[PDB]
Amino acid sequence: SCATGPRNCKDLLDRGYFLSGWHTIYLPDCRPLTVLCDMDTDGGGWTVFQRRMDGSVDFYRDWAAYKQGFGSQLGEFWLGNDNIHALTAQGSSELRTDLVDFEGNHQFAKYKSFKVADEAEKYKLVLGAFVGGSAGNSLTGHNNNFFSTKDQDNDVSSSNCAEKFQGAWWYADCHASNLNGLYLMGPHESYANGINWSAAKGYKYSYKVSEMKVRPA
Ligand SMILES: [Ca+2]
């Protein structure tokens, strides 16, 4: 139950769940949520809130969809902004981003803290110091930005970033990263509308795999 139940995937790792997979955790108000734990990468104990792997799922979705979450436990998903807020409210959570290109290269980025605010603050990103990684830093430029979707423009651009670059993100004017963008399968001619991490493969290359995950700092 909530009194004794795990709050995150690090609690589950500590209790001897050593294989990655879906487990029930208890959010701060006791709401149970089934989450994907990555128990393998970089020490394990990561709660995964975004996964892309094959383009099977449409990510060009509205505020409501991003708010509640969408996709499949068996594949690609967005866990949901209300859930991500709840998961990152208590304590301090480090962010890890894992990327794989179509050539087989694995790259990563790590930040020392990560929080998304509530819906009243439009799921604003509060991001701590970049730690390092082969992917470089394409998220600090998004610190302190509201989340935006095609139907709800909260960016700091005169344009509608989510529509122009075909994703959903804490867009600024407009982005350095776009991991909820179109699944464009490597090199693309269109500018900056793919699963892009510009510090690594740039604005014209869309990754094969994206995983975003958190663990207590
Ligand atoms: Ca705008």
From Swiss-Prot:
- Entry's Gene Ontology cellular component terms: collagen trimer; collagen-containing extracellular matrix; external side of plasma membrane; extracellular region; extracellular space; ficolin-1-rich granule lumen; plasma membrane; secretory granule lumen
Q: Which positions bind Ca(2+)?
A: D153, D155, S157, S159
GO MF terms, alphabetically ordered: antigen binding; carbohydrate binding; carbohydrate derivative binding; G protein-coupled receptor binding; metal ion binding; pattern recognition receptor activity; sialic acid binding; signaling receptor binding
Name the segments for region: A domain: 6-45
- Chief location bin: secreted
GO biological processes: cell surface pattern recognition receptor signaling pathway; complement activation, lectin pathway; G protein-coupled receptor signaling pathway; host-mediated suppression of symbiont invasion; positive regulation of interleukin-8 production; positive regulation of opsonization; protein localization to cell surface; proteolysis
Provide the protein name: Ficolin-1
Q: Report which gene this protein is encoded by.
A: FCN1
Shown portion of the complete protein runs from 110 to 326 of 326
